[PDB]
């Protein structure tokens, strides 16, 4: 639905009772819980809250813990290493498998917003190379990002640059003088028109 | 680690010898640190601690405070004072000053002026322009500073440091040198000072 | 005189307190004389707050239409621009102070309260007027005082107004204008209603031998820093804020004059929104005067220093 | 410096000739020296002049009244300098250029100092600034040095007239500024006076 | 007097006028009521930063005379010490003041009692019987000095200085001037500009002392020097304070804003009289 | 519990006195006001606690004042 938050709380609330009855469902439920927590963007807690303390040591659940740690730091190189290494334990379940493309985009999108800040001119092949994808998917991400306004600036496609915006100065004085300036025209027109 | 060692050295139920090893150790943890206030600010605190003058890293210490460049001979010795685990490296890890001196100097500079280029900032903190640009960005991002960057003309504009305040502050500097000159004149020869004051009261 | 003023008379206060003239008229007072002590202590205490509000108390007396402020002392109390009658917390500290004061030989009764509005001007707010209005019944004599300790450094002129407010349901006269030190965007409204409710009183002084002079001589060196106030950046936020609000008032004026106040054999009487342009012109003056005052701090530097060059 | 000066004068005054010759070579080498007034004025150094150690005062002169371009010019007649002595003169050229223009461009600095590049040049001004004898900042955008502050060494007693002229121009315009402000304050006051006058005058006649 | 008359001590004290006006005021009150002039003894507070002392503020203390000695009451002081420290804890206790002419034994007796509060208190003495035009407050510290082999508490005098506090100074201006409003209200231009005026007048006076010094070192009457001339030379050279291309536009940008701001206000003022003119005209010449 | 109430009562007094000077009656009422949720303390208990607090020197009586206490640190 898009109501990632309603999922997190229902899976979290469920896990305790799933501890009392026990296995096997605790293993599957735990994938549904980690998945849900990532999508909220973010307020991550599949592990400073309470869910599995001795069972987490088994390598099956282990992957998830590492995968979540990579998502919270928002580092691309680790995420992709886990996906390759412990392939089966994430990839075989179809529900989690479906979102994974979105999670990849999610990491890359947060990483981009951190990166952007030291520059005011950053090149598209430089960010594509840093994210680890081709120029065209990055170009498409940027366009959607400016319209959503999670990246600030505009593109120069005849030189392959981002003219990021830090071209701000004041503005606040200059617009208040404009509002003041428009009321004085209407006011003079009004007063002089009262005469006879 | 550096804070913890430093606190031990300030205790009086800690044995004498061990207070100094601990200070030695604190200095070394403080030297290895990364990003933020503490490495040059703890170096200054440590410099005020007279006990660092019994240490062999006193050289590095005094030289940093008096802003004197570091050379090869001194890195070799420092590296050797290190305990094996403390030879912790970025693949070139060394003694490098930077995190207070960039950050502390940016704070001293907000009190000094308005806005500045990277070239001048990099040349003043003796680092590449990119490192300054990186730490400045971090400081703006953490809200310990604010600013925006113009990378079209290669200038960062800060909530103060290097422009219209420089003009204002130069008036203050010039007028303070005038006061200084009046003090020096009162010191060498108080006779002319009294005599030439009476010359104003005549006009 | 010069020495007759210094002595306090218990009997003159006993007559005055019995007589109680203020019940007839609260616009009665007209002059102030404030001690050199009262003033310096009031500025320093205000400055110690920072840009955060503090309250203190004043000891004095009245003689005719003059108020006399002999001494002042600070209070460690919080509630200037929130708590109505913040002074109550202070009462225990005041009772101590007056008792300690009487025994060394200062017997003069409490004349009023002082507080300060830092970085927004010398005027009484909604909290302040409401606390004064209780005091003019209960505490008498009780007078409000306001000082700004940041604005003052730039101009060189002490802004100190001692005021008194009128009780509820009292019609103000035509006594409008006073000193123009700008207010922030949401504080503009609050001044607008309250100003006619009170008046400021004119101030005199006297001087002799330990505090004044460290300051007088120091200014001889110090003078450079006051000319590098350079307001236009320091309080940049003020211009954008007042000018966007002044625009909202001109919209109010276009409607008010345009449609007209609905009246059927009734004509407007005193209101804080009566003749909108006539009010509005003055709001433009408090914002303009501060702006050009900013220009004048710049103009001086440019002519004095920069024209000398190297000959 | 401070301390070192108070030691050197006494020592110069103490001895003669052969030791004084030695002392000149030591003062110029010795760090923290970016002044060369006091030793020159003493009688003791003065004896060596007009002889076979005259060249040592003539160089000392060249540091005191002159700069790095004045040196090179008579490099043959004067005895050698070491790295510390040359680097001290090179900083001391910047103060001189600063006496004429507040901002001095790189091409001027570069010529005068006879330096191999910009980066070697920019290193010398950073070293000066740490010792705090000159205060100032580099502009690599407009290619200027913009100096905040600089201090003399510069005895220059022929040229001193310039300093008196500038001090004098600083004087005469002051009064021209005061009569200035005095005028405006009276003009503000004159306007409020008339404005009060006219309103009170007009109001009375309404009554009739 | 009774004084050692030694070399000036290890601390400096700085001296300045309103507090004695506070003391004088009391002295006048007390004298009128009792029928005899009565002295007051009091505390000093201020600060010390280094070995140098800035005496910032003061307050009067309670005292009694038993014999020819003065005893200051301790309980009183300790009560006032707890209330004052709550509001001012930055300031600290320096010592005391007394009233009278030259130094006497009854001051040394009271100074030993003050040594109990802080081990090194300052002593200060004001003569309001002074026949002299210079500042008649003189500052002392106490030294323990041996005379004829017996250790005696003897005073030693300190010289003074003037120091900080602009926030306080602007009030000393008002206090000093004691000027009254003219025909109006006093003008906005007038009130604003006074600091600016006086500031120019300080620079007139600053130029004057440096200039006459430089000439004096050339001419004679002051000898030739290097240390002061190199610095005055350098002071001239700095002017004008910027000329860069970078400054010029930012300086004008702010000047240009305050040029529009002023224009939009003078129109608003004019609009008001226009609305007033048009109102009064329509009623009289027309029927509105 | 009885001992516990004393401590809580004490905690209340210090907490209230911190937030400077109050008359005895006022102090007691506030203690009740605060403590109402947990339990209603006996008046006799409060008075005992106040004295304990004074001995502890958490709070002192004003030198010259009918039933007044000051918060002393």
Numbering used by the authors:
A (entry chain B): 248 to 443
B (entry chain D): 204 to 406
C (entry chain E): 24 to 334
D (entry chain G): 8 to 215
E (entry chain F): 29 to 316
F (entry chain O): 672 to 690, 692 to 745
Can you quote the paper on this entry?
To study the molecular interactions between neddylated CRL2 (CRL2~N8) and the CSN, we performed single-particle cryo-EM to resolve a structure of the assembled CSN–CRL2~N8 (referred to as the holocomplex). The H138A mutation in the catalytic site of CSN5 subunit makes it possible to assemble CSN–CRL2~N8 complexes in which NEDD8 remains covalently attached over the time scale of the  experiment. Using 3D classification, we were able to generate maps of three different structures: (a) a holocomplex map at 8.2 Å, (b) a map of the complex with little or no density for VHL at 8.0 Å, and (c) a map of the complex with little or no density for CSN5/CSN6/VHL at 6.5 Å. In the model of the holocomplex (8.2 Å), the main interactions occur between the C-terminal end of CUL2 and the extended N-terminal helical repeats of CSN2 and CSN4. In our EM maps and the other published CSN–CRL structures, the exact position of NEDD8 and the CUL2 Winged-Helix B (WHB) domain were difficult to determine. To generate a model of the CSN–CRL2~N8, we performed cross-link guided modelling which allows the placement of the WHB, NEDD8 and VHL subunits using identified cross-links from XL-MS (“Methods” section). Our model of the CSN–CRL2~N8 satisfies all cross-link distances. A further two cross-links between CUL2 and NEDD8 (CUL2K382-N8K33 and CUL2K433-N8K6) allowed the positioning of NEDD8 near CSN5 (green text). In this conformation, the isopeptide bond of NEDD8 is juxtaposed to the CSN5 active site. For the isopeptide bond of NEDD8 to reach the CSN5 active site, the WHB domain must be extended from its crystallographic conformation towards the CSN5 by 19 Å.
The CRL2 E3 ligase consists of a Cullin 2 (CUL2) scaffold in association with a catalytic RING-box protein (RBX1), with the substrate adaptors Elongin B (ELOB) and C (ELOC) at its N-terminal. When associated with the von Hippel–Lindau (VHL) tumour suppressor substrate receptor, the CRL2 complex is the primary regulator of the Hypoxia Inducible Factor 1-α (HIF-1α) transcription factor. Activation of CRL2, in common with other members of the CRL family, involves a cascade of E1, E2 and E3 enzymes, which conjugate the ubiquitin-like protein NEDD8 (N8) to residue K689 on the CUL2 scaffold. CSN5 is responsible for the deneddylase activity of the CSN.
